[PDB]
Write a protein that binds this DNA or RNA. Sequence first.
RNA 1: GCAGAAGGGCAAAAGCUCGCUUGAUCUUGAUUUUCAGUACGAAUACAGACCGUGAAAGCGGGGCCUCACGAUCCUUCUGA
RNA 2: UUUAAAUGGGUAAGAAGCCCGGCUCGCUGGCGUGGAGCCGGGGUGGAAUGCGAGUGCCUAGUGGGCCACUUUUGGUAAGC
RNA 3: GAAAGCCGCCGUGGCGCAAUGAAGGUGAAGGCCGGCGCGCUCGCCGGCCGAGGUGGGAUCCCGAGGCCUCUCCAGUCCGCCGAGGGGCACCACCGGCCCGUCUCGCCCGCCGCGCCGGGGAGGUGGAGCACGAGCGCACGUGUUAGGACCCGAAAGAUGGU
RNA 4: GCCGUGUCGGCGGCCCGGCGGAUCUUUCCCGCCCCCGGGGUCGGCGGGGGACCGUCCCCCGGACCGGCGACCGGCCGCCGC
RNA 5: UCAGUAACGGCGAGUGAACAGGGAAGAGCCCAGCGCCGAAUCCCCGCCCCGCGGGGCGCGGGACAUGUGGCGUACGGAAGACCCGCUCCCCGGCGCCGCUCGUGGGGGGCCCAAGUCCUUCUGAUCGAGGCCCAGCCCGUGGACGGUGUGAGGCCGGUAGCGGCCCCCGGCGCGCGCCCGGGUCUUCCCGGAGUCGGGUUGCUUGGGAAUGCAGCCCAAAGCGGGUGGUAAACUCCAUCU
Lengths: 97, 147, 205
Amino acid sequence: YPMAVGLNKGHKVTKNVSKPRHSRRRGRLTKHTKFVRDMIREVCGFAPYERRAMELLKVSKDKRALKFIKKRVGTHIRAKRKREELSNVLAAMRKAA
Amino acid sequence: PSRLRKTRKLRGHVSHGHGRIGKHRKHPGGRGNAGGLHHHRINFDKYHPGYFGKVGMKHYHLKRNQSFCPTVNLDKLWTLVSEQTRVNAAKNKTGAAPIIDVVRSGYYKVLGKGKLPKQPVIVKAKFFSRRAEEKIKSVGGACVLVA
Amino acid sequence: APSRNGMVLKPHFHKDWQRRVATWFNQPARKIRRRKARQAKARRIAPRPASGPIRPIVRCPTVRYHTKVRAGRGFSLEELRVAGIHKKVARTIGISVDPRRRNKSTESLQANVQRLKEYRSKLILFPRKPSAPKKGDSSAEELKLATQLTGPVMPVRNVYKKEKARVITEEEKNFKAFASLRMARANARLFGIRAKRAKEAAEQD
RNA sequence: GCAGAAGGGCAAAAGCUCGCUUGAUCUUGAUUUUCAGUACGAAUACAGACCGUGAAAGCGGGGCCUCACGAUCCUUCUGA
RNA sequence: UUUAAAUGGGUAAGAAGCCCGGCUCGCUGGCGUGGAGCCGGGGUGGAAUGCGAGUGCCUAGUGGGCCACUUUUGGUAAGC
RNA sequence: GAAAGCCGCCGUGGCGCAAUGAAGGUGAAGGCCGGCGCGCUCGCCGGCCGAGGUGGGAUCCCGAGGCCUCUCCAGUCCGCCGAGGGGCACCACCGGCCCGUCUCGCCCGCCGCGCCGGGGAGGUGGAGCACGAGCGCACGUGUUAGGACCCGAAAGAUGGU
RNA sequence: GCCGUGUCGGCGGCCCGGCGGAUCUUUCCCGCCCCCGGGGUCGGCGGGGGACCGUCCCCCGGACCGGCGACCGGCCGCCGC
RNA sequence: UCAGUAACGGCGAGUGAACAGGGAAGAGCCCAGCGCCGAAUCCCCGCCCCGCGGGGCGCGGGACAUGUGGCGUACGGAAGACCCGCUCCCCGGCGCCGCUCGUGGGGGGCCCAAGUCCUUCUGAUCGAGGCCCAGCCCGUGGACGGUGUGAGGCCGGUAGCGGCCCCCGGCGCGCGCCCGGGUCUUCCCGGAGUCGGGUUGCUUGGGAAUGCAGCCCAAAGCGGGUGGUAAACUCCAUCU
Ligand SMILES: [Mg+2]
Ligand SMILES: [Mg+2]
Ligand SMILES: [Mg+2]
């Protein structure tokens, strides 16, 4: 009993299976390039704000450190990833001691 | 055609049809819709009530494809088909009912209107008004929705 | 300057428009120019078809037009794969290929594939010399003609259903009504709030 | 005397004291007044609601009446 | 200002009326009430004199006026 | 011949046939008979039809009666026809119906019983309905915008000698 | 000889007819899905015919006018040479 | 066409798009990188292979270049290892013949028919005339000049009319290039002071910033961009 508009809209058809195209996969971690970047964090060093952010992240505040990232990196969807990947680098040192 | 018009007819009369006194100059009352608020107020109104201000909500980038519902009301419904059938589907045997789908004719909605004749009908449309389908379910007809 | 009952007007003439006018005093003289650009191109190439390659079958993408069928751009790139022809011989066979196209339903897939496996069946090619690698005999005894017009396999052929005559059954003349559309709207816009009250049911514990 | 400018109106009163009191409330229209026969404003009779008063019929949607005020855009607050 | 002229203004001088008979009604309500409404039936000559009237459309020109008896306002008075 | 002719599985498309609403959206038929559930102002059912009624309304139809060398025997006719019937277009009114809000109210429906749909009766708002009249083309008139009936400045601006 | 309009018939040319028809037929004919090397029409789908109508083509038969649709003979009454 | 619409605007005057849809046209690709091939690459100089109107592939010198030349590769994937059944090419020049759709293009040079009688005049191209073929030619009655008004007096027009002179694309020997496809298995997979964000100006219909720029802070890998009302979460789509 199909219908014009609602939850089950319009013409019900068969959803043909298909492989995803090759440009749809643009940003997987691709381990060799992961090795290049994780080689380069410990030779090139860290950004001057994040060397200040990780002395904020542990003892000054825990919320204000993201708001400190929220103003220097663009938005809140870009500020959570920077906040939690520092807290893993700062967990890759603190817990490997 | 320059013969039939007035500037041959009014060639010799000195003021040429615009007064000795007003003596039509260039733009006496402002150009275009000038002064709809102030001095052409009585003329902007009475003849255009509603002209000044907001009335509704904005809809940024409306697309003229999704408000698209061309509407047949039932008195144009038998003339989508060949009339060779509506006499044929009226032969006294049974409920030999033909389909009449408006969506292969360019219509999406069946609106109500009285005076449908007494043959049994099935109608494929995407939208029905509740006056319209009771005008079909009273002639022994059915109302099959599809999209 | 406005007078008795009339129309308020906004003509777009305050901008200087007497320089950007485009008279069409040559619109005959271009039609007799671009027929010569076809007639000295229809005979110029070949008994290969004019009016371009074989174009796909494509359904129009809006609520307004999704009941009709349009000639499109190219076989998407798995029709070349289902019919089993290489993707870079397809445009020198004479089939048009659109690379970036999706397909997500078999209901519109097979109407291209049925066309595409039928095209090559109604096709003949020419040999260099008749060694004929994958070609049969002389092409139909010199192919009966030379060239087609305005589409090889008539790209619209918009086809329709019959449903010749039925019998009203019981349910069919009862259910599928106006109230089968209202609550379809009254639920699909109230789908989220009613699950939000079905989030509150848990915290009553 | 009726708050105030005049004119009109008023005596078991529209005045003067007394007793309650919120009809200076919500609501859709019609009409009158300057009128082009527009609008603001003011006013008139009504109708549906809730009330006040009175024992009652009633009267009362501001001042006894003729003036006391103000569009579009914008801002603000409230109402389902 | 008690009185109150002449001229002036409104209305009326019939069938769109009048009468009788009967049905609706949630209005009104001692009361086949009151009042509207509708249906059917009965009788055209209802002051003078003159004349063919009704209704819709589009829109030009005009928006600087002056003079005369008569009644008047400013002004001493004026072709003010 | 920059003409003319044809296309129609070239009607895509314009404008019209469907209005209202801010918007989600909704989207124009009553009549007559009979039978009924407290016929209870509410309401339920089949049937015949079918665009409702009132007052005017050109025209058309019936038309008592009359009208010819003598009175009684009949035919197509004609002309004057009193009264009466059907009533176009339209004009005024009353009703109905569609949509927007508001007062009052009870009922039903189930892709699944809910701050769910549907309906009713009153009163208003609408560029609506009530058997559609539009599109194309040409011409005239008028209004606007374009140097816009012709002529006219003191200026202003860029770029230069 | 004629042509109009309605009545049809010879279905006469339909299977060697014109155009048209979202009228018809799952015993007709191809490319397939549904079910267990096949099949069940088991529901069809993309496609072809042939049946019915709706309008046009001859026959004989009918009507009515022989009409600007024209000739035949015969008649009256003209006309030149 | 959508459209004078959505939108913008002392929401005044005014300005004002796009997506669908229909047609003309229709053509797609490469490189960096990632990894492999003993730089397998290019330039120049000189000599001769040997030919026009000149450049090639030979050979030896010199320079580039390892901070990366050339081959295969490009996001629809690609490589590599298979394994299976196919198949062995194209392209340039060289000489030409055989063509060429208005029959490729240019150039020069030619192609029918009355001045016959009479008449008028400064002068005819005027007016009249031509046996049973209607005097003559007509695929040639466009035009211009000729002492005035001409199918026939002369250039020319008509004609898949002609003859010439040069140039125009596509047969055919000598060169140069020269294994593609599918199936399964492993491997590789991308452009940074840029995107975004803030603030300021210009602009646009773009309205809580459409475009673009300055300045500052400055990215990420299940990442990033967009989805037309700013922000947070979640889901889905699409592109790189
Ligand atoms: Mg005038
Ligand atoms: Mg004037
Ligand atoms: Mg200056």
